[PDB]
Paper text:
Transcription factor (TF) IIIC, a six-subunit protein complex with a molecular weight (MW) of 624 kDa in humans, facilitates transcription of type 1 (5S ribosomal RNA) and type 2 [e.g., transfer RNAs (tRNAs)] RNA polymerase (Pol) III target genes. TFIIIC is composed of two subcomplexes, τA and τB, that bind two gene internal DNA motifs: A-box and B-box. τA binds the A-box with low affinity and is required to recruit TFIIIB to the promoter DNA. τB interacts with the B-box with high affinity and, therefore, is essential for target DNA recognition of type 2 genes. hTFIIIC consists of τA subunits TFIIIC35, TFIIIC63, and TFIIIC102 and τB subunits TFIIIC90, TFIIIC110, and TFIIIC220. TFIIIC220 forms an integral part of both τA and τB connecting the two subcomplexes via a ~550–amino acid residue flexible linker.
Our cryo-EM analysis yielded a high-resolution structure of human τA, which, however, remained in the DNA-unbound state in the presence of the tRNA gene. This observation is in agreement with biochemical studies on hTFIIIC, where the TFIIIC2 component interacts exclusively with B-box and is deficient in interacting with A-box. When inspecting the 3D reconstruction of human τA, we found that 50% of the cryo-EM density corresponds to the τA subunits TFIIIC35, TFIIIC63, and TFIIIC102 (τ55, τ95, and τ131 in yeast). TFIIIC35-TFIIIC63 form a heterodimer that binds the C-terminal TPR domain of TFIIIC102. Unexpectedly, the remaining ~50% of the cryo-EM density belongs to the C-terminal half of the τB subunit TFIIIC220. The C-terminal half of TFIIIC220 forms an integral part of human τA, suggesting that TFIIIC220 links τA and τB with a ~550-residue-long linker between its N and C termini. A potential reason why we captured human τA exclusively in the DNA-unbound state could be due to posttranslational modifications that may regulate the affinity of τA to the A-box motif. An alternative explanation is that human τA mainly did not bind the A-box due to the absence of TFIIIB.
Author numbering:
A (entry chain D): 419 to 449, 456 to 598, 604 to 886
B (entry chain A): 1262 to 1483, 1495 to 1598, 1669 to 1819, 1976 to 2109
C (entry chain F): 14 to 82, 89 to 113, 120 to 127
D (entry chain E): 10 to 96, 103 to 189
């Protein structure tokens, strides 16, 4: 029909570098590809809003045309934001119908990618995460379920949005007709695996910056369950680092330990591992490191970090006798360290604390001389004079503790940046331990003075 | 696992009360916690959760809360208030001690006790009146107050009998510590000459007070008299704070031993027995491991002042089996005084430790003064002239005379210090043509000894011309007359203090060492039986002039009733027109060194402490 | 004419009473008198308590039990600087003031 | 003197007291140190645990104060001094209510542990903040684990013991 000839004439306009005559030409036909020729002529012309309106009729006439679907929304985004630009990014394809709609899942993944950029550029962070999670679910659900992780939606955020959850094995627990590899083949036609890695990165980042660190950890564990990245040990290490970072920052210290234990055992001497491993095992209730620290110390008897750290475990177990030798042997290697001169001078005070009395003075002066080397190494500080106060409080020597605390109140906080002044400030703890001294001494008024002025917070 | 709860806790507290009462029958009247545990199971079958061991600790965990501890004490008092619930338990002289009767009587007593203390109220039926006035008009209303409920201390009663009594209370103790050598060196007749100045009534009163509180034990030898009694084991229990007396003087003995090495700037060093080839020419004092406990506190304090340096020589083997998975070789150390204090240590707000005098002469005149009212011209004119040759304006002269007039008017009684300060609070400010403050004016009258701080139950000032009954009159050894304030640590002859009694002052430091920050009204009342309470302040006055003790004050808190909010502050006692009465005390950083230097390490008075 | 609200949250704590369930049961009579005086009186199931006001040394922070559909949880509810320390009284029809035996 | 006032004694739900050692200017700042309502409720769920007060809750290396839980019989009494002035004279009337029964009190009695700030001291005595380093506070592995930095390894708790020992320069034969 004439529409074919007029479309050829419409192409003949572009063969002379013209677009605007498509508008009369279409107006002679209508009373689709002709609306697309008209819409894209309007896009080559300045009439971007009329192009979008014409693309509206295209999408109304041909909603399956992915390029029109994208073009309408992207032009609406170009015309403004927020201006209902995410409309006409509806896939309208059904998860039961994937026996054929797996082909349409190519469009769905492409649409979700585009939609994700509109959400991200708008700042609808939760909706952006929803597109990322749905895409990653389509990619990786065959491991999330093996991680016993599933996807749900709820209004708990104030609107119906998606979240990851663990599922109980009583409900759900840890490739027919080649469907999984067909899904893999069609979806890898959109995104190469490095973009699946980029999706992993983007999702983890967005989950972290949304403070949904718990769900990032669930995604990480599911991604570690994804063998086809877990087999790339560089990716695995990077996932482990994210998994550790999330499990630290959500305070799931039990889950954090399971990661940091692996990294340390592979790199027995890097300091910025041991610095983190210590605090994870400090906040976690799990005792499991005690046997682990024996195994690694027997593995690496020279290792200074373990030599002190194994001392911490025995000292925490109350076996001050065997603990001390591991601090002192550490101190032989790094004598100008306040912590090791502290931990030894503190250990002899634990020993002197016990019910036995034998030569107890010799243990105390061996205790307090090593604390003087701590103080001398550390310099005059709130920390330095407090800790000798508490050390002399533990032994009940409160005729000396009282002056170590008063000195620490008269001395201003450790200024260095990174944490706010009232959080470096020990004024509270030392006013409290004085308030315990004063309360125990029957002086409520002086205890009250301290809590009113120093402990107002 | 075990989970205790309010129900079993309450019954256990009753079993604790029953245990406390039945401890008066048999020491450890329970056969084992089983007897309680049976009552627990019999009352609460869920006590199958709980072991007999858990009972033995739970009976000691709960008492950690003062409110629950007070709840125990009040209910125990409400038991002890009525003999009828205990008499048949306590009065039995037969069946006194066997496990079956002890078990049976314990259960029976607790079963009876559960009739007095019960989950539903004894009497929910009572009529109770409409308001406080109606309440007291109808009912006598009574409750258990705390054993600490008291008012502040106050001036004692008006009689010369009270003046005699409040000196005699410690003249007796000035005998009780004397050895036979003192009883010979100041002979029996010479102390009888002293005691016969005081009436038998107040003597019986003072001895009864001492005897009633078990402060006195009968002497064995082969009115009160020196041969009659001595400081009881419990009297020493008053002063025998857990710190053994020897520490402080042993801690000076360490310091004085240390001066044998002189002084040096050598930093501390920590070194291997593996490096015996490296030595500081061995010029350091070796520490006596398991030396007397003063060797421990001396190093602890000298570290804190930054005034000592140490060679801690430790081998490569503190641990004999160190290679094992799972014997302490305690290790030698050597010391030397520093030349100069380490930077920024706890500078003691006091004279340098080397500057001190290391002798008994350091004790203030308070402990050695002799008073002599005849030492100066009787006429006020001499003291007016002394103030006229001082900087005093005539406004200060009449102000001083205005202050003096009140004190001389009371005769043998004295104006208490706080009464005087209120009455002449207008003289505080030194304005209005004054040049002197009230405190300077009264201090001048005291220092020019028109006045004496004769004390009593609280600080009172009296005219020097009439202070006599507040002072002991005695003689030095043929003899010469002397007069002094009576104190337990002063010699009956008045000529001297007793250095062996100053274990009282060593104990006083150990008191404030055990309870640093103790408020004065609790410290002074603690000695309520033993020490005439002003004498507690003079020991505190002493230790502060030695530098061992620091006084501090708070301004008195306004009552917390009726939507008030506490005026909670420290103060520096600036004023009388507004008060600052709550003084409290702290030890100073070096009190053991500052005290020990004063006293020779002679054998302590404490030997009676053996059971 | 004029009316105004003034308030304070006095925490009351009771003593001289053991193995009790009074607070669960006593509501049948529950009365307070002299509340603004120095020694207010509490009548409770016709038990009678007397005491003095005291400052809390710390702030006493009071939380309410709450339930999730069951599991117990807490919510913050109050804080108070001020507290009332109480002792069970004894009565006999006979005068002024509660006698406290030291 | 006015008559006794009848009081609505709710008995509605029990109340739990935390004797917080401080003066609470604003509850939004106090509650984080107890670990919040989530924290104290979890510690109310198991009486073998102890309530831990972190006086410096922004710092991971804050070793906490520990509570002892106790039973008690207690009530929260809201007084309402319904004040008036009336023809004219000022007047006062009372309303009051007892909001609940306080069965339980947490008292802080264990002294604050030893505490060691996140600052290294080089042998030259200069202080270096690891708070810029070890806090992991930016989630993208802010503490890059292989970096050359000081070892900072405080023991999990610097003491097991929060009460003073009976030692007073005292030996015994035992």
């Amino acid at each position: 029909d004439m529409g074919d000839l007029y479309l050829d004439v419409a192409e003949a306009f572009l063969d002379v570098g013209e677009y605007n005559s498509a508008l009369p030409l279409l107006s002679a036909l209508v009373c689709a590809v002709v609306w697309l020729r008209h819409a894209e002529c309007l896009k080559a012309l300045g009439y971007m809003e009329r192009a979008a309106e014409s693309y509206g009729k295209v999408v109304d006439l041909a909603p399956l045309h992915l390029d029109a679907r994208i073009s309408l929304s992207t032009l609406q985004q170009q015309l403004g934001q927020p201006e209902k630009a995410l409309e006409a990014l509806e896939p309208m394809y059904d998860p039961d119908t994937l026996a054929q709609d797996a082909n349409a899942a190519q469009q769905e993944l492409k649409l979700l990618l585009h939609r994700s950029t509109l959400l991200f550029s708008q700042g609808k962070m939760y909706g952006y995460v929803d597109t990322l999670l749905t895409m990653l679910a389509m990619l990786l659900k065959v491991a999330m379920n093996r991680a016993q992780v599933c996807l749900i939606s709820s209004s708990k955020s104030g609107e119906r949005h998606l979240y990851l959850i663990k599922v109980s094995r009583d409900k759900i627990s840890d490739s027919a007709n080649c469907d999984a590899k067909a899904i893999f083949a069609v979806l890898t036609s959109v995104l190469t695996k490095d973009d699946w890695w980029n999706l992993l990165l983007k999702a983890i980042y967005s989950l972290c910056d949304l403070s949904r660190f718990q769900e990032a950890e669930l995604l990480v564990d599911s991604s570690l369950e994804y063998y086809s990245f877990y087999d790339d040990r560089q990716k695995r290490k990077e996932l482990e680092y994210f998994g550790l970072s999330a499990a630290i920052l959500d305070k799931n210290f039990r889950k954090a330990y399971n990661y940091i234990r692996i990294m340390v055992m592979e790199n027995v001497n890097k300091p910025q591992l041991w610095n983190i491993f210590n605090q994870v095992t400090m906040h976690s209730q799990d005792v499991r490191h005690h046997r682990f620290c024996l195994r690694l110390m027997l593995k690496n008897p020279e290792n200074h970090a373990l030599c002190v750290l194994n001392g911490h475990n025995a000292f925490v177990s109350g076996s001050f006798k065997h603990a001390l030798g591991q601090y002192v042997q550490a101190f032989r290697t790094h004598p100008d360290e306040p912590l090791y001169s502290f931990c030894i001078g503190l250990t002899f005070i634990h020993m002197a604390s016990q019910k036995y009395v034998l030569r107890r003075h010799a243990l105390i002066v061996q205790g307090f001389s090593f604390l003087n080397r701590y103080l001398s190494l550390r310099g005059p500080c709130q920390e330095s004079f407090y800790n000798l106060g508490r050390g002399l409080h533990q032994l009940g020597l409160i005729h000396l503790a009282i002056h170590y605390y008063q000195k620490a109140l008269e001395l201003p906080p450790l200024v260095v940046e990174g944490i706010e002044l009232d959080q470096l400030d020990l004024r509270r703890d030392i006013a409290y331990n004085l308030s315990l001294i004063y309360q125990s001494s029957g002086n409520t008024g002086m205890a009250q003075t301290l809590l009113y002025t120093y402990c107002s917070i | 696992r075990v989970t205790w709860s309010m129900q079993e806790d309450g019954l256990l507290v009753l079993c604790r009360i029953a245990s406390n009462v039945l401890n008066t029958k048999v020491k450890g009247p329970f056969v084992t916690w089983q007897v309680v545990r049976d009552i627990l199971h019999a009352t609460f079958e869920e006590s199958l959760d709980k072991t007999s061991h858990s009972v033995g600790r739970r009976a000691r965990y709960i008492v950690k809360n003062p409110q629950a501890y007070l709840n125990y004490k009040v209910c125990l008092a409400e038991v002890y208030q009525d003999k009828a619930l205990v008499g048949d338990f306590m009065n039995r002289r037969g069946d006194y001690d066997d496990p079956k009767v002890c078990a049976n009587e314990f259960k029976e007593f607790v079963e009876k006790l559960k009739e007095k203390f019960s989950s539903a109220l004894r009497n929910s039926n009572l009529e109770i009146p409409d308001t406080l006035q109606e309440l007291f008009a109808r009912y006598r209303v009574l409750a258990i107050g705390d054993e600490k409920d008291q008012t502040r201390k106050e001036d004692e009663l008006n009689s010369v009998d009270d003046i005699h009594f409040l000196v005699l209370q410690n003249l007796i103790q000035s005998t009780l510590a004397l050895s036979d050598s003192q009883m010979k060196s100041y002979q029996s007749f010479q102390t009888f000459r002293l005691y016969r100045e005081y009436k038998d009534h107040v003597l019986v009163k003072a001895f009864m007070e001492c005897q009633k509180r078990s402060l006195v034990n009968r002497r064995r030898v082969n009115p009160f008299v020196p041969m009659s009694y001595q400081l009881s084991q419990t009297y020493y229990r008053i002063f025998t704070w857990r710190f053994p007396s020897t520490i402080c003087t042993e801690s000076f003995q360490f310091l004085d031993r240390m001066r044998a090495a002189g002084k040096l700037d050598q930093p501390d060093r920590f070194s291997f027995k593996d490096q015996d080839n490296n030595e500081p020419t061995n010029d350091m004092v070796a520490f006596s491991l398991d030396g007397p406990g003063g060797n421990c506190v001396a190093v602890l304090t000298l570290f804190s002042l930054g005034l000592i340096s140490v060679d801690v020589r430790i081998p490569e083997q503190i641990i004999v089996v160190d290679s094992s998975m799972v014997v302490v070789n305690s290790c030698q150390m050597k010391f030397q005084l520093r030349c100069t204090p380490v930077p920024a240590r706890l500078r003691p707000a006091a004279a340098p430790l080397e500057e001190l005098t290391m002798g008994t002469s350091c004790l203030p005149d308070t402990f050695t003064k002799l008073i002599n009212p005849q030492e100066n011209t009787c006429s006020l004119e001499e003291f007016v002239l002394q103030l006229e040759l001082s900087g005093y304006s005539p406004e200060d002269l009449t102000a001083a005379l205005e202050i003096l007039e009140a004190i001389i008017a009371t005769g043998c009684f004295g104006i208490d210090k706080e009464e005087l300060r209120r009455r002449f609070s207008a003289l505080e400010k030194a304005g209005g043509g004054r040049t002197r403050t009230f405190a300077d004016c009264i201090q001048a009258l005291l220092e020019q000894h028109q006045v004496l701080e004769v004390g009593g139950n609280t600080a009172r000032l009296v005219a020097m011309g009439s202070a006599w009954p507040w002072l002991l009159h005695s003689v030095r050894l043929d003899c010469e007359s002397v007069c002094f304030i009576g104190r337990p640590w002063r010699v009956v002859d008045g000529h001297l203090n007793l250095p062996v009694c100053k274990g009282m002052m060593e104990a006083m430091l150990y008191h404030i060492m055990t309870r640093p920050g103790i408020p004065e009204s609790s410290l002074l009342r603690h000695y309520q039986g033993v020490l005439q309470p002003v004498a507690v302040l003079e020991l505190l006055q002493g230790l502060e002039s030695l530098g061992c003790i620091r006084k501090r004050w708070l301004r008195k808190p306004r009552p917390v009733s009726l939507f008030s909010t506490p005026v909670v502050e420290e103060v520096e006692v600036p004023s009388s027109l507004d008060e600052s009465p709550m003084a409290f005390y702290e030890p100073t950083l070096d009190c053991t060194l500052r005290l020990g230097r004063v006293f020779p390490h002679e054998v302590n008075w404490n030997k009676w402490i053996h059971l | 004419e004029d009316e105004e609200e003034e308030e304070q949250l006095v925490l009351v704590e009771l003593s001289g009473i053991i193995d009790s369930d009074f607070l669960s049961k006593c509501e049948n009579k529950c009365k307070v008198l002299g509340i603004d005086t120095e020694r207010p009186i509490l009548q409770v199931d016709s038990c009678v308590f007397a005491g003095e006001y005291e400052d809390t040394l710390g702030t006493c922070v009071i939380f309410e039990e709450n339930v999730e559909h069951n599991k117990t949880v807490l919510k913050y509810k109050c804080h108070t600087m001020k507290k009332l320390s109480m002792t069970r009284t004894l009565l006999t029809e006979k005068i002024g003031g509660v006698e406290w035996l030291q | 003197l006015g008559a006794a006032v009848p009081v609505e004694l709710r008995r509605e739900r029990r109340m739990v007291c935390v004797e917080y050692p401080g003066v609470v200017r604003d509850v939004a700042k106090m509650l984080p140190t107890l670990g919040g309502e989530e924290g104290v409720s979890r510690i109310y769920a198991d009486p073998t645990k102890r309530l831990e007060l972190y006086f410096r809750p922004k710092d991971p290396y804050c070793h906490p104060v520990c509570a002892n839980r106790f039973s008690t019989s207690s009530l929260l009494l809201r007084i309402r001094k319904r004040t008036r002035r009336q023809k004219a004279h000022s007047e006062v009337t009372f309303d009051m209510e007892i909001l609940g029964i306080i069965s339980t009190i947490y008292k802080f009695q264990g002294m604050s542990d030893f505490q060691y700030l996140a600052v290294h001291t080089e042998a030259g005595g200069k202080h270096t903040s690891m708070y810029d380093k070890v806090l992991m506070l930016r989630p993208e592995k802010e503490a890059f684990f292989h970096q050359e930095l000081p070892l900072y390894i405080p023991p999990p708790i610097f003491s097991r013991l929060d009460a003073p020992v009976d030692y007073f320069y005292r030996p015994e034969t035992q």
